Enzyme design. Structure first.
Site, PDB file in Angstrom:
ATOM      1  N   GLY A 189      75.815  67.212  50.877  1.00 42.37           N
ATOM      2  CA  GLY A 189      74.782  67.200  51.905  1.00 42.37           C
ATOM      3  C   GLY A 189      75.192  67.551  53.321  1.00 42.37           C
ATOM      4  O   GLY A 189      74.486  67.200  54.244  1.00 42.37           O
ATOM      5  N   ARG A 199      91.238  73.569  44.691  1.00 43.15           N
ATOM      6  CA  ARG A 199      92.660  73.868  44.750  1.00 43.15           C
ATOM      7  C   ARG A 199      93.504  72.779  44.088  1.00 43.15           C
ATOM      8  O   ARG A 199      94.541  73.079  43.508  1.00 43.15           O
ATOM      9  CB  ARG A 199      93.148  74.096  46.183  1.00 43.15           C
ATOM     10  CG  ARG A 199      92.758  75.458  46.757  1.00 43.15           C
ATOM     11  CD  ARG A 199      93.563  75.774  47.981  1.00 43.15           C
ATOM     12  NE  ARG A 199      93.233  77.066  48.567  1.00 43.15           N
ATOM     13  CZ  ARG A 199      93.614  78.245  48.092  1.00 43.15           C
ATOM     14  NH1 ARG A 199      94.363  78.348  46.995  1.00 43.15           N
ATOM     15  NH2 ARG A 199      93.232  79.346  48.718  1.00 43.15           N
ATOM     16  N   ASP A 233      69.672  72.651  42.542  1.00 43.29           N
ATOM     17  CA  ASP A 233      68.968  71.368  42.646  1.00 43.29           C
ATOM     18  C   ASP A 233      67.535  71.642  43.062  1.00 43.29           C
ATOM     19  O   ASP A 233      67.281  72.437  43.974  1.00 43.29           O
ATOM     20  CB  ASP A 233      69.609  70.399  43.658  1.00 43.29           C
ATOM     21  CG  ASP A 233      71.014  69.926  43.258  1.00 43.29           C
ATOM     22  OD1 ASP A 233      71.506  70.222  42.147  1.00 43.29           O
ATOM     23  OD2 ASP A 233      71.638  69.229  44.090  1.00 43.29           O
ATOM     24  N   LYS A 266      69.640  64.159  36.950  1.00 42.70           N
ATOM     25  CA  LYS A 266      70.680  63.228  37.397  1.00 42.70           C
ATOM     26  C   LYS A 266      70.393  61.802  36.978  1.00 42.70           C
ATOM     27  O   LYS A 266      69.262  61.328  37.027  1.00 42.70           O
ATOM     28  CB  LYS A 266      70.864  63.301  38.907  1.00 42.70           C
ATOM     29  CG  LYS A 266      71.532  64.585  39.389  1.00 42.70           C
ATOM     30  CD  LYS A 266      71.723  64.590  40.899  1.00 42.70           C
ATOM     31  CE  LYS A 266      72.446  65.849  41.391  1.00 42.70           C
ATOM     32  NZ  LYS A 266      73.929  65.835  41.192  1.00 42.70           N
ATOM     33  N   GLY A 291      72.860  72.576  46.144  1.00 40.45           N
ATOM     34  CA  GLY A 291      71.843  71.545  46.301  1.00 40.45           C
ATOM     35  C   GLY A 291      71.058  71.825  47.554  1.00 40.45           C
ATOM     36  O   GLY A 291      69.963  72.430  47.537  1.00 40.45           O
ATOM     37  N   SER A 292      71.681  71.428  48.655  1.00 36.10           N
ATOM     38  CA  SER A 292      71.042  71.431  49.953  1.00 36.10           C
ATOM     39  C   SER A 292      70.964  72.832  50.538  1.00 36.10           C
ATOM     40  O   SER A 292      69.968  73.183  51.179  1.00 36.10           O
ATOM     41  CB  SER A 292      71.795  70.476  50.889  1.00 36.10           C
ATOM     42  OG  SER A 292      71.909  69.198  50.278  1.00 36.10           O
TER      43      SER A 292
END
Ligand SMILES: [Cl-]
Ligand SMILES: [Cl-]
Ligand SMILES: [Cl-]
Lengths: 278, 278, 277, 276, 276
Positions: D148, D160, D19, D76, D230-231
């Protein structure tokens, strides 16, 4: 080589067979003549236990001796769950198998018989894979996957056979690391869960029981993956026990042959009417 | 002879010891000088994890290497529950034990690490006998019976030590026939339940952890039957870590000697104040 | 002490079968079969269950007739808390009083103060706490009781396993934890400790409730009981005398499966009883 | 065709998608060896912390990212916001992520992804959901944990779950698959296709809480085809070095010696938040 | 033996036991006529206000108190913390108080007090609890109200409960005592001993919220053998004068003229807290 593996091996001889509940020596001879792989000596057939109630116990040793003398096929008999003395008595009579049976009146609500203390092999009931594996760990050499007793309705037997076999199939492809939690959720011993995973089937012989009333029912259980069937009420609460007994034996032997299934089903008398519990 | 028995044997060397949580090489040397049997490398002591929150993970391998170089006693380190890659990394660093630890942030809510896939021994936590035996079956070579993390309150450690040891004592005298049901109710593997019954103790080393703040607390755990203690917060959140560390080591070595316990407890600085959660 | 004397007397009954009897004919059948004692009562538990009504101490006349008809010990039932029924029984000159839950409860909150009597008492129990409470009140013998009048052994098994299981837990328990255990049992601490030191109940313990077959009787002995009561199982069966004998032999030879086969073989109809599920 | 889009996404197998919120983050990602960049307004940790309505990024910022790199550029769109997706496609990016980290635009319906030429990524938490997104035209699935937080727990749970159900399905009695499809609320034909393949019919990446090289390698050892981050990179102390370490961890996921090396002396990971 | 410990504690009858945290507080207590001092880390009002885990005091501080006075010295151990009690006994103090104002160490079990040579004090709120503590080996009982509030209400409630049940027991039909023992969850032999004595088989002091001379005399008029004062002295405006006044109030509890004199012109009582 271990004593348990010997008992497990003994029960493998019954594969492809029908075990018939009998209450006297006449029923026993009809069963042997029809091609039963074994007879099961008990006080009253499950449909009569259901209808009449009362406390259902191990049969009188005299009646069991009479049955054992009347046939050359293996003789099994029922003991109440947890009633280890009834089982001692049965073993001392010299029969071939003990069925620690839920159709008799439960004697111990919290503990089953410690079946490893016996030389004779035991059959136990189950409704799911966890329960089967618990019975095996206690020393059962054979498992009866049980539906409804004494109703002639195959629905619960189908449910329980599909449950046991379905969980075995899930287990075969399962990530090994997830098997510990699966064993916990089954409340089953991990070693037996792993053995079941490696074999891809139950570690002992698995028969269906409960509500087998017609040749079609018996063949259905075999097509769902069972090793054989018990029939209790379905023969001896029917219009023609001897012909029906033979038809069911043939259905189990020829379970994948619809032409044969038609022939043996054609012109049987009245099936047990039974009861729909809905 | 089996690889598991070798790991179990390794952990036996720690009996009678104190394992001290350390976050850097300075804390590690203080611990070794005070007579710790091992150090536990982690990112933050449990009291700081509690107070600050955030996701708590395996420590940076660099900090673990610095600790391993600073001492000659065994070095343990923490991995998140179910984080088998964190454990792979720790093993590849060449430390002596992995603690699959509930004070770090859970990585897998349903499955622990398959510890039999590793050469290095593991410590796991428990609160009851069932849980201990499940961790052992997964391959834990040592058990930490765990109270409250990061509070300085020994109450839950006492509760859990008494629960584990109490169930072991019940098991020793239990009718063998009732052990199957006991294993079911613990959701624990039967073979390990029977092994515990025959030994009359846990099949691996059992240390207490959680809220050990004073020499008295440490000796209490030993008098309740533990093989040793972990101390995390109680040393390094106190006024004089080095003197307190030594006092706790002596308390564990001399746990049944009240005269010695007075001496080591006398004129320690401020204990960790901690928190009463009730 | 006078209590230790009563407790000592009951030890004679170890290895025996006590048979409920409602008249002198039943009493003689019981003695002939080898009963260690008879229990005089108005109606067998299966009949109390089936018929209802208030069940009380038997008429002293019927008790006197039973006492004259046999030389083995004669016990009789009094309602729980009915200390005057017990005074009467003692004045008749019988050997034991059973303060019995099969009779209609007379006092819901208090049992008889059994230490006020010279005659020994039997009381029922379902768990260890209850047994110890009855003993503290002065019971010299305990009957671990299942279902009355059903021929179903399930609750007797449950209660025997509960009492014996708690005794086994107690034997190995940390001494410091016994105070709390006594609190949780609501039992006197001194009797809990005595049980811990003995590794068994401080008085004779018999099983009762649903013993219908020789197998049932031997099962109770293999679970650790000192003997069994049989109420309905004999006199609601097809052949009371032969069954009575078989049950006596089963208790004597409880660990001998060959003997158990022989005595069980060809016995007539057992009491059919009732499955309460 | 759909099979062409599904084939395109197969190229990303073994990769890390990063991201990025501007062209600087995009170049750091390409230099570190990312297989693609994901253009968005704010990283998920900032959306969580700040709130507000989160929408498609300004087309200008997306154009700047697309010009700054040669690797595929994804962006996105809000769930159900088919006009945001039309706009993204008209910009000429390579993939659209119909993303649950943005503010839901349609609570009942996703984008009809078959109406687009560009391939779509969609999120899932279970196999039923994955198969529904595929039937709507998703060419790639992101099996999503917590957004996040830096906590891998829900990603592990969902990976899983998806893979576990696929394994159950492989050995299942054929006659029981109809009921299984009903219980998943998933199209029967896709359930059967999954059964025959023994894996998801499209590329499956893990996402949500990947903060460390160990986390990334864990997702690969659990059977994912790649990972989104992302973060975890851009809320850390050293984004460029961490980005590289994660790429290497995904490439060398079964090599613990390599995992030690790349993990050794990284700066501060994103601190994140334990929600449980 | 137990009877020796029980006999020792009988010497404290008619006295005031004062909680002290250092040697200065200890000397003020002895000068005021306390029958004993209770060494602890913090007075109950401070434990309440500040929280934290409250443990046995440092042995050094206990030694300093024991050297500073000639009256008996008691000290507190956490409930169930038998090693804290071992340590206290090894210091050579006169009594151990297994105290509920400290942080509970064992939620299910108290100390087995018969394993010690030193006498123990334990708390109670009702007769069943008192008898359980005595059976475990307590040689003295503290009937406890609220700790650290200055509010006598719960002490009155608990004193009335214990003494009320003792009075019920004295006249009870003997045949009903078995059930009474069951309902108290108390050992039958101790219940019968209480019935025959017509009072608790050990010394019974009141504690909890004694803030004024009037409060102390009230506890004595309700039938207690003495009182503990923790917070009420050392959280007041003039600890030494108040301490003396309370001692006099306990000695002269049935003399209202004396109670006026000792109460007159004391400084500020502890303000405390009304919880209800
Ligand atoms: Cl039943
Ligand atoms: Cl939203
Ligand atoms: Cl507390």
């Amino acid at each position: 080589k271990s004593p348990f593996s010997v008992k497990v091996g003994l029960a493998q001889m019954l594969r492809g067979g029908v075990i018939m509940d009998v209450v006297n020596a006449e029923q026993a001879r009809i069963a042997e003549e029809a091609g039963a792989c074994a007879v099961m000596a008990l006080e009253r057939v499950p449909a009569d236990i259901r209808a009449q109630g009362g406390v259902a116990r191990m049969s009188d040793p005299q009646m069991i001796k009479e049955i054992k003398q009347a046939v050359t096929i293996p003789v099994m008999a029922k003991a109440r769950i947890g009633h280890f003395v009834e089982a001692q008595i049965l073993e001392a009579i010299g029969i071939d198998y003990i069925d620690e049976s839920e159709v008799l009146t439960l004697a111990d609500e919290d503990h089953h018989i410690n079946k490893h203390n016996f030389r004779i092999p035991f059959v136990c009931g189950c409704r799911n894979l966890g329960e089967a594996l618990r019975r095996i760990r206690e020393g059962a050499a054979m498992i009866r996957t049980k539906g409804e007793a004494g109703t002639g309705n195959i629905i619960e037997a189908v449910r329980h056979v599909r449950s046991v076999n379905g969980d075995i199939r899930v287990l075969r492809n399962m990530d090994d690391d997830e098997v510990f939690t699966f064993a916990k959720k089954l409340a089953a011993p991990y070693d037996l869960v792993m053995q079941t995973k490696q074999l891809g089937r139950l570690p002992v012989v698995q028969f269906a029981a409960g509500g087998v009333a017609t040749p079609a029912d018996a063949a259905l259980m075999m097509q769902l993956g069972c090793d054989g069937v018990f029939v209790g009420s379905g023969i001896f609460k029917s219009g023609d026990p001897a012909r029906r007994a033979r038809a069911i034996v043939q259905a189990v032997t020829h379970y994948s042959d619809p032409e044969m299934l038609v022939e043996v089903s054609c012109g049987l008398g009245e099936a047990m009417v039974g009861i729909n519990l809905n």
